DNA sequence: AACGAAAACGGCCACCACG
DNA sequence: CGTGGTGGCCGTTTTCGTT
């Protein structure tokens, strides 16, 4: 179980993400999906006794929001070497849906030589909206997304890593494929509300957390 | 941080625009978006110790409002050579959305040979309204705008320059992409009210400034 | 500053029209736009010490309202030779928007050989409504008007002449291009109310004037 | 008796207003 | 900002008139 670094969120998840499965967090923009991704990108490298996976991180960005400085802040919060964190995070920006899936081909071969624990795909659904904008082409983007999700599941079962994808809510296919769906909504200021909206094992429940300069971290009224 | 040349606005932004990110200023017509652009087009060339970026400026105009004389006024205000300011500002008028995006192809290659600090796109959303006026073609202009914004983010991360685009409020996609949204409204006479309407780091707050012959400059009751 | 020949209007404008810039007067029909044009067509020829520009006049008519006799009346009011006034006013009626813009080609070359101070375009927006009456052709007339306005600004900067265009209010593009917007409304009888509705330098303010056989001239209760 | 044109009705889309 | 309602425009079908 990879620690989220929010204790309340860890309790909500019973200790953190299950490696080897896809966890989807759907919420409005600015809810902190990207911030949680940046935090996990570092916490994954933490020792297992500290809630990490003792593995490198993979950040596939489609939205430009990748900040190595956020990774440095998370590393210094938990006392990890920021330089080693950036050395254990491989980053690449996907320009389109086809490029987004093509990066998985390099990811599968690269993930064999080194132990990874986390795969991050940020604005995973944005490129299927920007690229495929027509109505007759909807089935094509749905097929590409389906294949992409199957590839995610395959890599998860192959390397035993956690698969994190982010969705902006301004597909029903992900429900059966994703094991845990988390709904994120803004509480005013920088403090966010998290809700579980389906889990066969986890209750439907809510937990409050905040977005702090160092971290994605528990709410401290 | 590129100085806005309004001290109150600089305080509002904590010192000025972050280079390497897109800052959107949405407001009514005649609020001073273009005036701020003209001021920044010169202030960017200022020394870093003076709040500049020590880089050349790029003005992509779609509305005809480009005035080299305004640049000369800003240069003489801060004591910069007006001729050198015009020599460090490359200007081109986009005739359509396709031409607006096509100019980015020349911009990316040209921005490699010389250091730039500011990219200005004035009436950035006007051409998507004048060109794409139908209702069935809305998705096409939205896709073109999405690609344009992604190109802006790519150039920002590539050259570490500030990306400034102006929007007339007589898209929701820009919210996640733009880092700082500023709402501009008219105070009567030539003095304008600025408000921050989203920033993960900057407070929602307001600052009063004026539009002076020399400058975009602090309000002086 | 070209005298309007109304003292109250001159005070409203701080002495008269700035040459080298476009001044737009928007108002209802019969408010006196054409009358003001006829008056200025003669006052421009007045000595600079008398509020003129010591230059010839250019009247481009689209509405048939051109009256040389009104020019003769204005000339005799200020004591100018009516025959020389008509000799210093070149007149041409535009039959369409394309012809209206085409006349500018003859105007630019003709304005080089002799000094002019005033360019008048009467019912400037009427031909874009009579010619382009459909809804799909709106962008075409807007583009033609935009190019026409840019040509006006170019000629203004080239010859340092005043650019006067008249608009019947039974485009938002002119706002940034026009420097001074004047709203004209009828006071009953022949006495008209003038209001300034935008000027970066001139206050929003009003002045009362009348339309007299000799002149456009101050209100005399 | 057949074909073409005109008029009327219905449905869909867009814009405006209200919550 | 989103949803619902109303109005306008366009397309299709039916009926009538003319060849």
Residue numbers in the entry:
A (entry chain M), B (entry chain K), C (entry chain L): 101 to 270, 289 to 339
Provide text from the study.
RAD51 is the central eukaryotic recombinase required for meiotic recombination and mitotic repair of double-strand DNA breaks (DSBs). Here we report the cryo-electron microscopy structures of human RAD51–nucleosome complexes, in which RAD51 forms ring and filament conformations. We found that RAD51 forms multiple conformations in the complex with the nucleosome, such as ring forms with eight (octameric), nine (nonameric) or ten (decameric) protomers, and a filament form. Notably, we found that in all RAD51–nucleosome complexes, the NLDs of RAD51 directly bind to the DNA wrapped in the nucleosome.
DNA end binding by the RAD51 L1 and L2 loops is also observed in the nucleosome without the dsDNA–ssDNA junction (blunt end) in the presence of ATP. The RAD51 L1 and L2 loops are known as the active DNA-binding sites for the homologous-pairing reaction.
